[PDB]
Amino acid sequence: FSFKKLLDQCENQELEAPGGIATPPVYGQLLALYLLHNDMNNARYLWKRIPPAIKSANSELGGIWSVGQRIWQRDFPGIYTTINAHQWSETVQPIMEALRDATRRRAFALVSQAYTSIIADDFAAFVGLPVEEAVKGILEQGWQADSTTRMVLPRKPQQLARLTDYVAFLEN
């Protein structure tokens, strides 16, 4: 629930500024929050909104955009690869951990809905877990796995007041 206010407070801080340019630390917070909610349209325009002087001075903004670039092309293995490739500051560390976990639920829902049978090697890349781990995870959720083929088979497991409003409108 706390993620609702954090995104709004960073957006407002960018709107009003003492000199029209916001602080470097709040730029990374806004970019990370956009990626957490899968709002890639505003994140992409935020990258162009960052002045080149700020982007060149702070290398953190370049790194956070690398993670977003993977999400933009829907490169699931690259989302986990770039998240752990670099070390982030403490003010955006907890939300970026939530971004990595949020990507994990996105992969789980995508496989459960868009796949009737997915090979284990590709399925492990989607979730971001090692191949052996992904084998043990599915049975805990009831998903069937078959040996000698290494293939996973996922499957998805005031009316009265309103009505009198309709009549009153029609009868005037």
Partner 1 sequence: SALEQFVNSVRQLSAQGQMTQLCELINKSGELLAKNLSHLDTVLGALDVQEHSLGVLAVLFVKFSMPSVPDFETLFSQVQLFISTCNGEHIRYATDTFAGLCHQLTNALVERKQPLRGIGILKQAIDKMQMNTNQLTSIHADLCQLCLLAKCFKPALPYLDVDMMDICKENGAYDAKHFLCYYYYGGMIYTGLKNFERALYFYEQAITTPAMAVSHIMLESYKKYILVSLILLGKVQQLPKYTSQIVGRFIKPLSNAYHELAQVYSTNNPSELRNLVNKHSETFTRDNNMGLVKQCLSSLYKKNIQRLTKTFLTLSLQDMASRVQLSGPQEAEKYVLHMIEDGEIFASINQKDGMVSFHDNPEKYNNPAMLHNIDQEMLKCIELDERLKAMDQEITVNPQFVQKS
Using CB under 8 A as the criterion, which residues of the chain lie in contact with partner 1 when the complex forms? 11, 14-17, 20, 41-42, 45-46, 48-49, 74, 110, 113-119, 122, 151, 162, 165-166, 169
- 152: β partners: 118, 145
Q: Which residue's CB is nearer to partner 1, number 73 or number 84?
A: 73
Q: Which residue shows structure tokens 């982030």?
A: 88
Q: Which is nearer to partner 1, 3 or 45 (CB)?
A: 45
- The smaller minimum CB distance to partner 1, of residues 54 and 118, is found at 118
Q: How far is the CB of 14 from partner 1 (least distance, A)?
A: 8
Q: Report the residue number, 7 or 92, with the smaller CB distance to partner 1.
A: 7
Closest CA to 22 of 35, 9, 37: 9
Shortest Cβ distance from residue 13 to partner 1 (Å)?
A: 12
Distance CA 131, CA 125 (A): 8
**The residue count for the chain:** 172
Q: State in angstroms the smallest separation of the CB of 109 from partner 1.
A: 9
Q: After which residues is the chain broken (C to N over 2.5 A)?
A: 157
Q: What is the DSSP letter of 145?
A: E
Report phi then psi at 117, rounded to 5.
-160, 115
For the CB of residue 134, give the shortest distance to partner 1 in the complex, in Å: 15
